[PDB]
Amino acid sequence: IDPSKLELEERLVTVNRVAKVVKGGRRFRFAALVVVGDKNGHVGFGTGKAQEVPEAIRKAVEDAKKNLIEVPMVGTTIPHEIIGRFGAGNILLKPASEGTGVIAGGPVRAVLELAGVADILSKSLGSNTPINMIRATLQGLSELKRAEDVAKLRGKSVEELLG
Amino acid sequence: PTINQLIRKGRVSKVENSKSPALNKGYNSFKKEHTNVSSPQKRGVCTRVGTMTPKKPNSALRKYARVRLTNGIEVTAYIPGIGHNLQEHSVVLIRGGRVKDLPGVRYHIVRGALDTAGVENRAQGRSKYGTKKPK
Amino acid sequence: VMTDPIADMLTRIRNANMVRHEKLEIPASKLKREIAEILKREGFIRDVEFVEDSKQGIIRVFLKYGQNNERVITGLKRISKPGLRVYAKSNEVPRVLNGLGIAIISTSQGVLTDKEARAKQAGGEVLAYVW
RNA sequence: GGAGGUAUG
RNA sequence: CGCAUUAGCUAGUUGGUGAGGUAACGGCUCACCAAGGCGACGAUGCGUAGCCGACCUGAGAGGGUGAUCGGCCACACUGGGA
RNA sequence: GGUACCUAACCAGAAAGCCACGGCUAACUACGUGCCAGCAGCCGCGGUAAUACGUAGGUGGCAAGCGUUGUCCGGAAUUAUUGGGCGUAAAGGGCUCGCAGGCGGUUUCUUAAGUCUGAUGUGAAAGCCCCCGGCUCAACCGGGGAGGGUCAUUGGAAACUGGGGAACUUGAGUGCAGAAGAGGAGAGUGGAAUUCCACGUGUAGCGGUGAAAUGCGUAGAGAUGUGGAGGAACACCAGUGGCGAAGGCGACUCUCUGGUCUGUAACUGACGCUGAGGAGCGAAAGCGUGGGGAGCGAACAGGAUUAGAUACCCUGGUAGUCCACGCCGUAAACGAUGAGUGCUAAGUGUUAGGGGGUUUCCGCCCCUUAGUGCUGCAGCUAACGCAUUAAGCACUCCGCCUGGGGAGUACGGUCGCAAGACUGAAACUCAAAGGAAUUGACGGGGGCCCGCACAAGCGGUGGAGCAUGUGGUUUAAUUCGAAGCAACGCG
RNA sequence: CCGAAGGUGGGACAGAUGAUUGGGGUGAAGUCGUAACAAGGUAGCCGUAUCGGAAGGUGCGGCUGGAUCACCUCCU
């Protein structure tokens, strides 16, 4: 995916001050986690370290732009329920009715709102570590099957699939 | 567990317990039994009024009272605010609320209830210290 | 010992599918054979052969992969198990993956998919989900 | 080149 | 509803014959026969509680409550009797 | 009740407080205070610059209310049916046998208990939900419906579960033919070595330690040769080798005896799996009775070491270790990994078989079972790692876990001669305890390397007199600063 | 005849209280040692027995959740 053609918004999920101990004291760095997305079905996340916070955030954006994925979206919701699982991060994502809006936790919300999903239910069922919740969310979103492509794979019409 | 195991011996919930057990017990004088009645406050008589040292990292002389409640329980209650008028035999009203750094102090004395005077010269959050509005 | 042949057959497919095998051979039974036939009719497997022998027969199932070697069958779950049977009312027959997958219900009309059983207003034992 | 055995602060 | 750190309980007890009694079937009571009945699918014992429509909570499954109003039950200083 | 309601006149006049403002969490400054006074739901504030204490100003959230406490649900997937786990974080019973129970291979017929379905009946009113209407609105009130059950009566369907009958052979077992094995019990036998006893030769120490001593020795030790007594254990073989359910089993021979593996398709034809409670087995220590007793060795004695040394070290040494019977029933009883079954890349050793390929063979190569190791895909895991011997993918059954202490404790019960074992809490208390991995630091850990670091030398200091600085003390003041290296002829 | 209450008696069960006593928990700075964490300076831990002011020591058996250096197999 070329991020130049997409109009990508950036959202700063978290900035953790981490420390490497050395003789004399402690080398602090900042680990920024940022999600970016076009709000039209593409979303990605990246992680950047640096000694200053602005530079950390800049490096996260470049990383995120490298790893964009395409989230299948039926109308304003997801095609079907899925449980995004990654390590201990375990996010359930359920399709919702029109006008429900995005009902998700903090980090999960960033991913879904930047992906441009308008109506979706979610619930974090495992660890709330931001990095792993995001990884679980994108793993789950990456497993969503669109009805049209399923029909092609199974050799049927969409009429037969939906029934 | 297996479904069959669950049938034979079900699940058992964790038994959560009250933070203020002394307030959850009444006393019937006729039967000389403790009743199980939850109360927001209990009346008591001060048997001892003094000061305790807090556990570290804190340091102070924290004013407390040993109170015998109407249900016969003896509890230590913390006296909030600056200065107080409690002595032995002072009748006081206690409420729930631990003092984090005072081991075994699990209740507060309500300022401005029964014998406990309001706090002198208190002007903000007066309602919490039983001080009437000055003019 | 063997306690759920249906579950065991589903697992053979799941495991073979996971490593993108072309075919697998399952020991046959009437009920397993009916499930296999549904998978073909619904386009989850390529073909199913029934080989006779002195014993109970063998079902050779040919798995189906799209372009880019993509697995058509994403997952299989056993629902009704020997330890806990699952029967559904006609109106409570489940849809699987929001209608993108199927459920196989054993009914007095026969071994049907969820859609087929629903059209007949029939319930029964919910054997498996396939998506 | 890697695994297994045989005094106070 | 809880407890197995409650495992055996029952002797009109469980059936039968007959009689008595009841608005009425019935060990409901008696007399005489037999030894049966209940229990690990939790009897018995202990503890706890009026039950419900409903009320509070929860996405739901559930959890808690059983005040006001309605239904049923039980009680009337304590025990028994008519 | 002259109440509601209506009309008229006068008057902004009588009618705003509570909590909070460090983060979670919307809302910051000044002063006082100085680990005191106090605050606190949690992290935590406060020890002379407090946005956390108290006050004041301002701001924020609500508002005739506002806070605190108490109780219930949620968040809590934190008892997980929906919807969790048990290698190392809490959690697999020490292991087997097995009653009840749970679960169960394939075909066909039948039945209709479970299962699905048609109709009928019923689930009061109020309440919740939907739609209307009346109180000036709202609360509230009223009308009409909807909704609600492992519900009952009566028909139907037969795929699955259950019951009955008849078949099938893969599971399981039997027969037949082979194979290995420290599997067990009993009875014998053998060689080495230690100790002791007797004797010959022989003389001054032997033994022990970091160094010594206690101890043994001229009463002839230790060393050396021959023979004998007795007890315990079985070098080499010997191997992530074998066998066993586990504990465990290692000299040889014989007696009795269990199990596993391979081939065969002769036979039975689902006869199977798991298994609470129960029964049996279960290292070492320990216990009872009676034997035995070389070595070893709790306790204990003495010699050392040490500030002390109720220890490590040394010289002795009792129970015990051994045997028979009985009891005890616990281990880091460990693979910290329950049993059964099936499925899912390979490479490579090794143990016991079978079949074959060129053969007298040897052998090499190929295949196949069943074990036992290593590496390693997919997959799994928090990570470490597991990976056809799963910690992967599934299904059946059993056991067990729900923060750390209190505590494997108290009470009760069962068992035991006793020691104790099994079962097994709570009050109270903390906001952690913990797993894996990472960065550094450290080690009386290892490796490598360097330095007036040591070594190889030279001359000093510490002693004396005095100069100077410092500490202490004395002073009216003995001004102030510097305090291991890195303060002290220093500013 | 049946029959409440009451009386006598011995047991069962539950609670309260009790001289004295036993550990347990928690506490801003106490005393004695230094048992564990590195090879923690005698590797540690588990069961058991015995001994000792105290941590603990020792014996028998077991485990690696043991450091350092040598040797035999396995794997790369």
Side-chain angles (χ1 to χ4, degrees):
Chain A
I1 301 78
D2 166 26
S4 64
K5 287 183 284 293
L6 308 181
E7 297 296 356
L8 298 180
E9 169 60 15
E10 307 74 351
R11 191 157 303 175
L12 168 60
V13 172
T14 176
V15 184
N16 203 328
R17 197 164 72 111
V18 292
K20 163 197 177 48
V21 175
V22 289
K23 188 172 55 160
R26 305 197 181 105
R27 307 298 186 80
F28 296 108
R29 272 187 298 173
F30 287 94
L33 171 57
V34 166
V35 178
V36 310
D38 59 2
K39 308 168 68 52
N40 188 260
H42 296 86
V43 68
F45 83 109
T47 170
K49 310 204 211 204
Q51 295 198 17
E52 271 297 350
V53 167
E55 288 65 8
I57 296 169
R58 181 191 56 74
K59 302 163 130 176
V61 167
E62 278 61 322
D63 181 12
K65 283 177 155 188
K66 302 273 195 55
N67 300 10
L68 291 175
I69 66 171
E70 188 165 352
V71 61
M73 184 158 50
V74 170
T76 61
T77 178
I78 60 174
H80 59 74
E81 67 288 16
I82 186 59
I83 299 187
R85 177 178 293 94
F86 186 95
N90 186 284
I91 307 303
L92 171 58
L93 297 181
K94 287 237 299 294
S97 59
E98 298 298 342
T100 305
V102 177
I103 294 167
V108 182
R109 163 173 282 96
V111 169
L112 298 175
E113 288 191 7
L114 286 179
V117 177
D119 297 318
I120 182 172
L121 297 173
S122 71
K123 175 63 176 170
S124 55
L125 303 176
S127 172
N128 70 79
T129 309
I131 179 57
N132 290 335
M133 282 205 305
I134 291 182
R135 287 189 177 279
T137 297
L138 289 162
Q139 193 277 357
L141 293 175
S142 171
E143 291 303 339
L144 291 174
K145 319 203 78 195
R146 221 186 302 263
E148 55 86 0
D149 69 271
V150 172
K152 179 272 178 178
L153 287 178
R154 296 236 303 278
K156 293 194 176 299
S157 74
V158 174
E159 290 61 9
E160 292 171 357
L161 256 61
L162 299 184
Chain B
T2 74
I3 296 296
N4 200 78
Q5 278 173 328
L6 294 178
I7 301 318
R8 296 160 48 210
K9 48 188 77 169
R11 303 285 202 182
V12 181
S13 59
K14 278 208 285 301
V15 50
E16 205 288 339
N17 52 19
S18 178
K19 299 173 298 154
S20 53
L23 290 182
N24 291 11
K25 304 294 299 313
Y27 178 72
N28 187 324
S29 59
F30 295 146
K31 319 311 175 178
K32 292 166 297 301
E33 305 183 18
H34 281 100
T35 61
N36 293 34
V37 170
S38 66
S39 303
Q41 296 88 15
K42 274 292 199 296
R43 172 168 55 85
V45 179
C46 296
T47 175
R48 176 165 78 259
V49 183
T51 60
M52 280 161 53
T53 59
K55 72 181 190 186
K56 51 188 152 65
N58 289 341
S59 175
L61 289 186
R62 302 230 183 277
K63 284 66 166 183
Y64 76 101
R66 189 74 172 170
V67 178
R68 176 167 302 289
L69 294 178
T70 56
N71 53 25
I73 309 307
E74 278 280 20
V75 302
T76 312
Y78 177 78
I79 302 146
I82 309 279
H84 69 77
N85 57 325
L86 304 186
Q87 310 78 349
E88 283 59 352
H89 306 308
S90 298
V91 180
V92 306
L93 190 69
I94 80 173
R95 60 171 180 74
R98 73 168 314 84
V99 171
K100 172 66 121 52
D101 60 327
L102 291 186
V105 176
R106 300 175 73 183
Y107 309 97
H108 279 51
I109 287 179
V110 184
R111 299 305 301 263
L114 308 188
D115 301 354
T116 84
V119 175
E120 306 303 342
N121 314 318
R122 170 67 90 144
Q124 311 183 5
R126 281 179 296 97
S127 62
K128 294 197 179 174
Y129 299 86
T131 297
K132 288 167 184 293
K133 193 166 201 297
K135 167 56 215 67
Chain C
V1 300
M2 176 76 75
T3 54
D4 192 353
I6 289 79
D8 181 300
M9 149 173 167
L10 291 181
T11 291
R12 290 167 174 266
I13 299 167
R14 195 189 300 102
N15 299 349
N17 177 32
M18 187 158 59
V19 300
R20 301 184 207 266
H21 278 5
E22 180 48 35
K23 48 165 288 302
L24 65 151
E25 289 191 339
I26 307 165
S29 70
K30 187 177 77 175
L31 183 48
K32 283 187 282 187
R33 187 171 187 273
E34 272 296 353
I35 293 173
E37 177 51 33
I38 287 172
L39 292 178
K40 182 176 66 178
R41 175 164 55 257
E42 298 297 349
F44 283 100
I45 59 176
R46 186 181 317 293
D47 185 343
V48 52
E49 307 170 355
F50 189 11
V51 181
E52 310 319 320
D53 61 61
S54 63
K55 302 174 188 180
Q56 63 183 85
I58 293 180
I59 307 174
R60 175 174 306 97
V61 176
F62 297 81
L63 301 85
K64 183 182 172 183
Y65 310 87
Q67 312 312 332
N68 322 323
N69 199 9
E70 173 44 37
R71 289 183 275 260
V72 174
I73 287 168
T74 74
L76 312 173
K77 189 170 176 60
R78 186 81 161 101
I79 304 301
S80 180
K81 312 170 172 172
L84 169 56
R85 304 291 176 178
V86 181
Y87 311 101
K89 270 51 170 62
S90 297
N91 60 331
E92 309 311 330
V93 166
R95 290 203 177 185
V96 176
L97 278 288
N98 196 108
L100 303 185
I102 69 180
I104 308 185
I105 303 80
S106 179
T107 73
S108 66
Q109 307 309 317
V111 175
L112 319 179
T113 70
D114 52 352
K115 197 191 322 188
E116 296 167 353
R118 208 168 303 144
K120 291 185 173 173
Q121 285 75 0
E125 188 162 6
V126 180
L127 299 181
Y129 292 173
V130 176
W131 65 107

